[PDB]
A paper describes a structure:
Using a minimal, active RNA initiation complex that spans the portions of vRNA and tRNA that reside within the RT cleft, while eliminating dynamic peripheral RNA elements that do not interact with the protein, we solved the structure of the minimal RT–vRNA–tRNALys3 initiation complex (miniRTIC) to 2.8-Å resolution, allowing for de novo modeling and definition of RT–RNA contacts. Density corresponding to the cross-link between p66 C258 and tRNA G71 is visible along the minor groove of the PBS helix. The tRNA 3′ primer terminus is displaced ~5 Å from the canonical elongation primer site (P-site), away from the catalytic triad (D110, D185, and D186), and resides in the P′-site. In addition, the p66 thumb opens by ~6 Å and adopts a hyperextended conformation reminiscent of RT–DNA–NNRTI structures as reported in past analyses of lower-resolution RTIC structures. The tip of the fingers also hyperextends by ~5 Å to facilitate binding to the wide A-form vRNA–tRNA template–primer complex. The majority of protein–RNA contacts within the RTIC are located in two distinct regions that are one turn apart along the minor groove of the PBS helix.
A packaged viral enzyme, reverse transcriptase (RT), initiates DNA synthesis at the 3′-end of a host tRNALys3 that is part of a binary complex preassembled with the 5′-end of the HIV-1 viral RNA, called the primer-binding site (PBS). Kinetic investigations have shown that reverse transcription initiation on this vRNA–tRNALys3 template–primer complex is slow (~500-fold slower than elongation), nonprocessive, and displays a distinct pausing pattern along with the viral genomic RNA (vRNA) template. The resulting minimal vRNA–tRNA template–primer complex contained a 26-nucleotide fragment of the vRNA genome and a 39-nucleotide truncated tRNALys3. To circumvent the rapid dissociation of RT from dsRNA substrates, we adapted the previously employed disulfide cross-linking system to covalently link the RT p66 thumb domain to the vRNA–tRNA template–primer complex.
Numbering used by the authors:
A (entry chain A): 4 to 62, 71 to 133, 142 to 557
B (entry chain B): 6 to 217, 231 to 356, 363 to 427
Write the structure that this text describes.
RNA sequence: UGGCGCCCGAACAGGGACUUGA
């Protein structure tokens, strides 16, 4: 009695005509038996002459393929792109899980669209219900089940029902007997629509082994993460390990994945043994030690406040815990993404805070209170002196050892009594070699030949040379907007070794003023350094 | 009968994903959409509708009640032809010359006009759910939606009839509605302007139209010209910063020269060395200063081209913005003075309102903010019933030297 | 055979900063 969803093919298109796969001897009998069983059940009907279509079916089950029909049918709007997180589930006193036996098969199919699902075997059958694997079946089933549950959901505000693909997570704050009575009422309501569900001695008890999680009455976790303790490591093994401990990272805190992922850079073969780096081995040992003891999450409590605490563990790595009560956290996570070739600790912390904010809004629909390892003065300085509209919500300072700070600052005005370095760098595209150097108002000069370098690399090398050859206070004048912007971003770590050298040398310097002057305008010392480094490039 | 609406030929309705919303916003949206469905303004739809436009909840200015804000930017783009060509609303060039311009909201009147039956599909939106617990609630408009640029296009026939007695009674008041607001400009004393706005509100109420950033003064709008430093003693660093600034400005003002100023930076000198400007250098600096104070000559608004707005975070709560259609062809440069996200949202809304008042068209914004932060927090401070098209860029370090 | 999460690679487009030659 479920109202069918009106579906139609894409404009100016007709159902596919695909010949049967090469299977007519062994699986044919099983397919015929399955088709007869479905026809007896009423989910399958026979139409031979007036159904000029066909689809490729291959079996035992009958896995009918709708690859062609999927692209010939009008698109739907799926909403459940993601999956519910156990941390977002509300702590309910009693929880029952109902599986919908024959989920799709209980939802009828549009009468006009039934023909396009022709089902011919070496007979001509057509689906009367939602086919399996069809593009429209998931959305149609989800909408039909939402419609079916609406009368029950409205009449039972206390009962919470989360619908997955074919699973009903029914949670209630009622006593065991009342919850069982309501569950039987829900089962009868579903049966009124033909959706059969298991009875008392057919229902699955907890833990619920669901989508990689282990849902307990008052806690949640993941299935045991047994990492492969082997000597060799192929790219396939590294990918499997990274995925396994990325799954665990949402509950297990302190998980690091940077060296393991870095090992996957440039790899081409799926079996190429990788020389696990010493850093990677140490990180893997740390992850094993973290996974040694079990960790369980808690369910969301809307009455309490949602706190998010972030910790810096070095190498551009961040771990956060989201909790409401101390030492009992809903879920954990990590943020190691490097947004841009250059970044500093404060920008990375802002990105992590934004990621956690979006993640919490997705799971809990509310931003959490942030407990960040950054002083209020540091954040004030950064976001006041920064050119972006950076902002983090209400947050509280936590005095942890790995405090987030800025390791160097560029002077706002030239340093009186310091030395000025006019740095330039020229690169020859053809030969790929170039030069970098500097000139100083004191009268000094220096040009260092480079090789296999670009113009930007030459500019950075010139700046690095000036920093090396200058005292603790230096005025550096450059004509490269690229390097000027990089240095003014105040990066702490970079993907370039040269930029990291520049960063450490800036940290060494007590005062560093970086000025910019337009190139080729004949501005004092800039033209001199350009003439110096232009002999072999221009 | 309804007004048939057709998308641009060969182009398909919007399929924009719904951004996640907070619990309070979701609850507000659920309640207001239930009310609208009971009133018949929207209807629930099945999965056979592939189109979707993100919907947000905002609190209007000086109000605590929540308001729905459907992001019809994609639908506006896809109805561009319809709503701009065949039912366009002329923009009065005299609105920017009015002492006071009040901005009424008249979007509630659109819900009295049914939407074309064959177009309601594209006006489809989903209310999300927390933690994907339940499928999003899919709705669909049965009346002219707020935020769609074709709603004023269809309703202007009724709006002209409504306003005819008012305009005849006082032809010195300029009225102009862009999407959902009614920009009413007059050269009357603010008390008299408020009295006439109350009279217009009563007129709208008589004709069924309902009505509750709000009061603007386009007469007192001035551009933010480029200003050179005014120093008595000039250092090498100061002179070369000035030379760089003038070299960049010469891309805007062809008459800007830096020959004599650059002639001062002749050798390799310390940045703190004090260089006394020569007679020629001082004269050329004066000429550059005089050239800079006046606006650029030869920049004209092109209705064919889209307006572009660039915003620079100057720091200390101050923001500079430029409105242009071609690079270095600023139609308007200004400054906004006051939380970076809140200040940027206020600046964007003010710039868009100015663009509507002047050229009757919102600009495209190059926002100096990370994309995720904006898409997460812009709705927390938005107060307008419209949403401008924006993109996210990295402001060059030397472009923040607009002041 | 399809979706989701992660990683690599490629081509596209655009938003920018530079080198050289014509
Ligand atoms: C969060 C919304 C869905 C939660 C309910 C998921 C269905 C219950 O989880 C079930 O656990 C069983 C063992 O207990 C497993 O055999 C099944 O594969 C699994 O689906
Ligand atoms: Mg150079």
């Amino acid at each position: 009695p479920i109202e069918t969803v009106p579906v139609k093919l894409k404009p100016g298109m007709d159902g596919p005509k695909v010949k049967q796969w090469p299977l007519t001897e062994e699986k044919i009998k099983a397919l015929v038996e399955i088709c007869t069983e479905m026809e007896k059940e009423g989910k399958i009907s026979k139409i031979g002459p007036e159904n000029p279509y066909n689809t490729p079916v291959f079996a035992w089950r009958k896995l009918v393929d709708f690859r062609e029909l999927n692209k010939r049918t009008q698109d739907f709007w799926e909403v459940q792109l993601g999956i519910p997180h156990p941390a977002g589930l509300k702590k309910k006193k009693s929880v029952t899980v109902l599986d919908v036996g024959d989920a799709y098969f209980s939802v009828p199919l549009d009468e006009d669209f039934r023909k396009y699902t022709a089902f011919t075997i070496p007979i001509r059958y057509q689906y009367n219900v939602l086919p399996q694997g069809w593009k429209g079946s998931p959305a149609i089933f989800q909408s039909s089940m939402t419609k079916i549950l609406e009368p029950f959901k409205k009449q039972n505000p206390d009962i919470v029902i989360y619908q997955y693909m074919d699973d009903l997570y029914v949670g209630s704050d009622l006593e065991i007997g009342q919850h069982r009575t309501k569950i039987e009422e829900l089962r009868q309501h579903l049966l009124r629509w033909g959706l059969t569900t298991p009875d008392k001695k057919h229902q699955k008890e907890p833990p619920f082994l669901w989508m990689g999680y282990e849902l307990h009455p008052d806690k949640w976790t993941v299935q045991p993460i047994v990492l492969p303790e082997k000597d060799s490591w192929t790219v396939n093994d590294i990918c499997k390990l990274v995925g396994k401990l990325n799954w665990a990272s949402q509950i297990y805190p302190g998980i690091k994945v940077r060296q393991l992922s870095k090992l996957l850079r440039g790899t081409k073969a799926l079996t190429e043994v990788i020389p696990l780096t010493e850093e990677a081995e140490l990180e893997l040992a740390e992850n094993r030690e973290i996974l040694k003891e079990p960790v369980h999450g808690v369910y969301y409590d809307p009455s309490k406040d949602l706190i998010a605490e972030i910790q810096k563990q070095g190498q551009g790595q961040w771990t956060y815990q989201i909790y409401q009560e101390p030492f009992k956290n809903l879920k954990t996570g990590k943020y190691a993404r490097m947004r841009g070739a250059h970044t500093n600790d404060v920008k990375q912390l802002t990105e992590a805070v934004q990621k956690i904010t979006t993640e919490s809004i997705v799971i809990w629909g509310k931003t959490p209170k942030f407990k960040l390892p950054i002083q209020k003065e540091t954040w004030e300085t950064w976001w006041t002196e920064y050119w972006q509209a950076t902002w983090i919500p209400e947050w509280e300072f936590v005095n942890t050892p790995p405090l987030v700070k800025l390791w160097y600052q560029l002077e706002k005005e030239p340093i009186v009594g310091a030395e000025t370095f006019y740095v330039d760098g020229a690169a020859n595209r053809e030969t790929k070699l170039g030069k970098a150097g500097y000139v100083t108002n004191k009268g000094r000069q220096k040009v260092v030949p480079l090789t296999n370098t670009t113009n930007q690399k030459t500019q950075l090398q010139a700046i690095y040379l000036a920093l090396q050859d200058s005292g603790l206070e230096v005025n550096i004048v450059t004509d490269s907007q690229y390097a000027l912007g990089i240095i003014q971003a105040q990066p702490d770590k970079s993907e370039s070794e040269l930029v990291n050298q520049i960063i450490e040398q800036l940290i060494k310097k007590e005062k560093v003023y970086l000025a910019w002057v337009p190139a080729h305008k004949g501005i004092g010392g800039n033209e001199q350094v350009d003439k110096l480094v232009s002999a072999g490039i221009r | 009968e309804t007004v048939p609406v057709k998308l641009k030929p060969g182009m398909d309705g919007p399929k924009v994903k719904q951004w996640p919303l907070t619990e309070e916003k979701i609850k507000a949206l659920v309640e207001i959409c239930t009310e609208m469905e009971k009133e018949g303004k929207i209807s629930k739809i099945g999965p056979e509708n592939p189109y979707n436009t993100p919907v947000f909840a905002i609190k209007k200015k000086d109000s605590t009640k929540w308001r729905k804000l459907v992001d019809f930017r994609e639908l506006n783009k896809r109805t561009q032809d319809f709503w701009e060509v065949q039912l366009g609303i002329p923009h009065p060039a005299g609105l920017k010359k009015k002492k006071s311009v009040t901005v009424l909201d008249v979007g509630d009147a659109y819900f009295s006009v049914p939407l074309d039956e064959d177009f309601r599909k594209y006006t489809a939106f989903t209310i999300p759910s927390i933690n994907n617990e339940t499928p999003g609630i899919r709705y669909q408009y049965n009346v002219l939606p707020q935020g769609w640029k074709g709603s004023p296009a269809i309703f202007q026939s009724s709006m002209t009839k409504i306003l005819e007695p008012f305009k005849k009674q006082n032809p010195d008041i300029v009225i102009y509605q862009y999407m959902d607001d009614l920009y009413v400009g007059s050269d009357l004393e603010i008390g008299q302007h408020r009295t006439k706005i109350e009279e217009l509100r009563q007129h709208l109420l008589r004709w069924g139209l309902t009505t509750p950033g709000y009061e603007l003064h386009p007469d007192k709008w001035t551009v933010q010209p480029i200003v050179l430093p005014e120093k008595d003693s000039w250092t090498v660093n100061d002179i070369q910063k000035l030379v760089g600034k003038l070299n960049w400005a010469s891309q805007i003002y062809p008459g800007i020269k830096v020959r004599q100023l650059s002639k001062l930076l002749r050798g390799t000198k310390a940045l703190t060395e004090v260089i006394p400007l020569t007679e020629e250098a001082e004269l050329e600096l004066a000429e550059n200063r005089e050239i800079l104070k006046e606006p650029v000559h030869g920049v004209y608004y092109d209705p064919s081209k889209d307006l572009i707005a660039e915003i620079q975070k100057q720091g200390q709560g101050q923001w500079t913005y430029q409105i242009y259609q071609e690079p270095f062809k600023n139609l308007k440069t200004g400054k906004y003075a006051r939380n970076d996200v809140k200040q940027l949202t206020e600046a964007v809304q003010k710039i868009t309102t100015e663009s509507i008042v002047i050229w009757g068209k919102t600009p495209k914004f190059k926002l100096p903010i990370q994309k995720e932060t904006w898409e997460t927090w812009w709705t927390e401070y938005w107060q307008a019933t419209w949403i401008p098209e924006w993109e996210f860029v990295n402001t060059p370090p030397l472009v923040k030297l607009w002041y």
